[PDB]
Design an enzyme around this catalytic site. Structure first.
Site, PDB file in Angstrom:
ATOM      1  N   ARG A 180       0.698  17.676  21.835  1.00  0.00           N
ATOM      2  CA  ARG A 180      -0.020  17.239  22.880  1.00  0.00           C
ATOM      3  C   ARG A 180      -1.029  16.088  22.508  1.00  0.00           C
ATOM      4  NH1 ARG A 180      -4.953  19.328  26.064  1.00  0.00           N
ATOM      5  NH2 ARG A 180      -4.833  18.332  28.116  1.00  0.00           N
ATOM      6  N   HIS A 215      -1.485  12.480  23.815  1.00  0.00           N
ATOM      7  CA  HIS A 215      -2.810  11.926  24.489  1.00  0.00           C
ATOM      8  C   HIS A 215      -3.186  10.673  23.876  1.00  0.00           C
ATOM      9  CE1 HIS A 215      -3.018  15.171  27.371  1.00  0.00           C
ATOM     10  NE2 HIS A 215      -4.351  15.442  27.162  1.00  0.00           N
ATOM     11  N   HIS A 254       6.692  20.836  27.757  1.00  0.00           N
ATOM     12  CA  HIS A 254       5.992  22.015  28.328  1.00  0.00           C
ATOM     13  C   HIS A 254       6.893  23.020  27.936  1.00  0.00           C
ATOM     14  CE1 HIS A 254       2.955  19.577  31.109  1.00  0.00           C
ATOM     15  NE2 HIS A 254       2.718  19.430  29.680  1.00  0.00           N
ATOM     16  N   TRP A 294       4.494  28.209  30.020  1.00  0.00           N
ATOM     17  CA  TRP A 294       5.577  27.773  30.907  1.00  0.00           C
ATOM     18  C   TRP A 294       6.828  28.852  30.611  1.00  0.00           C
ATOM     19  CZ3 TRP A 294       2.318  24.194  28.439  1.00  0.00           C
ATOM     20  CH2 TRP A 294       1.643  23.132  29.544  1.00  0.00           C
TER      21      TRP A 294
HETATM   22  C1  HEM Z   1       2.223  14.341  34.534  1.00  0.00           C
HETATM   23  C2  HEM Z   1       2.284  14.446  32.988  1.00  0.00           C
HETATM   24  C3  HEM Z   1       1.323  15.490  32.485  1.00  0.00           C
HETATM   25  C4  HEM Z   1       0.519  16.564  33.028  1.00  0.00           C
HETATM   26  C5  HEM Z   1      -0.376  16.389  34.166  1.00  0.00           C
HETATM   27  C6  HEM Z   1       0.111  17.361  31.942  1.00  0.00           C
HETATM   28  C7  HEM Z   1      -0.764  18.570  31.776  1.00  0.00           C
HETATM   29  C8  HEM Z   1      -0.940  19.390  30.642  1.00  0.00           C
HETATM   30  C9  HEM Z   1      -1.813  20.587  31.389  1.00  0.00           C
HETATM   31  C10 HEM Z   1      -2.969  20.604  31.931  1.00  0.00           C
HETATM   32  C11 HEM Z   1      -1.647  21.334  30.113  1.00  0.00           C
HETATM   33  C12 HEM Z   1      -2.763  22.386  29.471  1.00  0.00           C
HETATM   34  C13 HEM Z   1      -3.745  21.932  28.309  1.00  0.00           C
HETATM   35  C14 HEM Z   1      -4.739  23.273  28.102  1.00  0.00           C
HETATM   36  O1  HEM Z   1      -5.084  23.881  29.150  1.00  0.00           O
HETATM   37  O2  HEM Z   1      -4.865  23.454  26.782  1.00  0.00           O
HETATM   38  C15 HEM Z   1      -0.860  20.288  29.074  1.00  0.00           C
HETATM   39  C16 HEM Z   1      -0.170  21.171  27.962  1.00  0.00           C
HETATM   40  C17 HEM Z   1       0.597  20.322  27.154  1.00  0.00           C
HETATM   41  N1  HEM Z   1       1.281  19.270  27.146  1.00  0.00           N
HETATM   42 FE1  HEM Z   1       1.199  18.506  29.053  1.00  0.00          FE
HETATM   43  N2  HEM Z   1       1.019  17.198  30.748  1.00  0.00           N
HETATM   44  C18 HEM Z   1       1.790  16.251  30.983  1.00  0.00           C
HETATM   45  C19 HEM Z   1       2.589  15.470  30.197  1.00  0.00           C
HETATM   46  C20 HEM Z   1       2.972  15.708  29.078  1.00  0.00           C
HETATM   47  C21 HEM Z   1       3.750  15.011  27.962  1.00  0.00           C
HETATM   48  C22 HEM Z   1       4.582  13.942  28.390  1.00  0.00           C
HETATM   49  C23 HEM Z   1       3.984  15.954  26.941  1.00  0.00           C
HETATM   50  C24 HEM Z   1       4.700  15.594  25.599  1.00  0.00           C
HETATM   51  C25 HEM Z   1       5.781  14.478  25.437  1.00  0.00           C
HETATM   52  C26 HEM Z   1       2.960  16.782  27.052  1.00  0.00           C
HETATM   53  C27 HEM Z   1       3.051  18.065  25.940  1.00  0.00           C
HETATM   54  C28 HEM Z   1       1.961  19.031  26.408  1.00  0.00           C
HETATM   55  C29 HEM Z   1       1.894  20.056  25.328  1.00  0.00           C
HETATM   56  C30 HEM Z   1       2.554  20.269  24.103  1.00  0.00           C
HETATM   57  C31 HEM Z   1       1.076  20.828  25.827  1.00  0.00           C
HETATM   58  C32 HEM Z   1       0.644  22.345  25.254  1.00  0.00           C
HETATM   59  C33 HEM Z   1      -0.388  22.163  24.170  1.00  0.00           C
HETATM   60  C34 HEM Z   1      -0.870  23.286  23.541  1.00  0.00           C
HETATM   61  O3  HEM Z   1      -0.707  24.549  23.826  1.00  0.00           O
HETATM   62  O4  HEM Z   1      -1.897  23.376  22.692  1.00  0.00           O
HETATM   63  N3  HEM Z   1       2.484  16.954  28.141  1.00  0.00           N
HETATM   64  N4  HEM Z   1      -0.210  19.543  29.688  1.00  0.00           N
END
Ligand code: HEM
Length: 291
Positions: free
Chosen positions: A45, A49, A172, A188
């Site tokens: 993540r 970002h 995700h 997820w």
């Molecule tokens: C429309 C695109 C995106 C949206 C709206 C979105 C949204 C979010 C949401 C809100 C979570 C939760 C964060 C938290 O509460 O800690 C997050 C987690 C995550 N996202 Fe996305 N995300 C998107 C795209 C992506 C992309 C493109 C990737 C990677 C190539 C990414 C990888 C991750 C990872 C790995 C986490 C889990 C992080 C953890 O557990 O520490 N996301 N995402």
């Protein structure tokens, strides 16, 4: 503006494999994080970002400049819940002060995907730290409470097409949402420290119900205790996205190949590689090194 990759003075593949190794060995050392999810999802993540601030129309933002190191960007509300991942990498930076911040943050993501049994992701060095005044304003990362047309339009700014978007969202499979970071609650899927096509399979195969969570936001919930963001769910609401979701649910090898390409592209958006720059590096996992 042009950002030309500049290889850190005298470094080559073996120099970066050592930094890979330091990150991979620290993932092991700190594997108890978040009741044994470990730090892999957070580093993936983080890498997204710091790259996701890019605007292709004027080459602002992007991974090149390392600007996440500035408080304007690390305190972006969209970056809540990455502070630990930043602190995870700070000491490794201290161990290898010659690596640039953008190289380190991007290499964190690559290392995490590979050490979680994901595809190999080729990685290139030469990002160069840029000063405080080049930090992008907050607001450039995507909102989760949106639909498929938002997602498609959003990702155009990152030069990503429908396949690339559906592939990147497959990350995700990793980690989870927390109310305190994003106002969303839950994972997820079940194996969320393993990189697999589980996101697509759960999207397709679970029964989802729109519910309101404890932060007043709506999300899609299964009785197995998994969730989907409105943006995740949009990938089966849209016919073009639905087709690709099905393709990755039925073929994890194809998903891995497309994710590898898309994620490398994400991490390299905004960067000009000189014609005589080195070829991308493919690092060995700790397992392959018998480490
Ligand atoms: C429309 C695109 C995106 C949206 C709206 C979105 C949204 C979010 C949401 C809100 C979570 C939760 C964060 C938290 O509460 O800690 C997050 C987690 C995550 N996202 Fe996305 N995300 C998107 C795209 C992506 C992309 C493109 C990737 C990677 C190539 C990414 C990888 C991750 C990872 C790995 C986490 C889990 C992080 C953890 O557990 O520490 N996301 N995402």
């Amino acid at each position: 503006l042009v950002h030309v990759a500049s290889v850190e003075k005298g470094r080559s593949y073996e120099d970066f494999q050592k930094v890979y190794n330091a990150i991979a060995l620290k993932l092991r050392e700190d594997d108890e994080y978040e009741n044994y999810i470990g730090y892999g999802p957070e580093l993936v993540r983080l890498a997204w970002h710091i790259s996701g601030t890019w605007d292709k129309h004027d080459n602002t933002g992007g991974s090149y400049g390392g600007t996440y190191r500035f408080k304007k960007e690390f305190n972006d509300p969209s970056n809540a819940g990455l502070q630990n991942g930043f602190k995870f990498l700070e000491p490794i930076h201290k161990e290898f002060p010659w690596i640039s911040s953008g190289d380190l943050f991007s290499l964190g993501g690559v290392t995490a995907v590979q050490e979680m049994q994901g595809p190999k992701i080729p990685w290139r060095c030469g990002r160069v730290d840029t000063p405080e005044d080049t930090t992008p304003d907050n607001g450039r990362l995507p909102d989760a409470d949106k639909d498929a047309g938002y997602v498609r339009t959003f990702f155009q700014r990152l030069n990503m097409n429908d396949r690339e978007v559906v592939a990147l969202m497959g990350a995700h499979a990793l980690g989870k949402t927390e109310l305190k970071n994003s106002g969303y609650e839950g994972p997820w899927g079940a194996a969320n420290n393993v990189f697999t096509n589980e996101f697509y399979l759960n999207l397709l195969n679970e029964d989802w119900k729109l519910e309101k969570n404890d932060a007043n936001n709506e999300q899609w919930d299964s009785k197995s205790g998994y969730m989907m963001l409105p943006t995740d769910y949009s990938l089966i609401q849209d016919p073009k996205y639905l087709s690709i979701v099905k393709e990755y649910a039925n073929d994890q090898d194809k998903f891995f190949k497309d994710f590898s390409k898309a994620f490398e592209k994400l991490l390299e958006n905004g960067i000009t590689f000189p014609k005589d720059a080195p070829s991308p590096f493919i690092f060995k996992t700790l397992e392959e090194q018998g480490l």
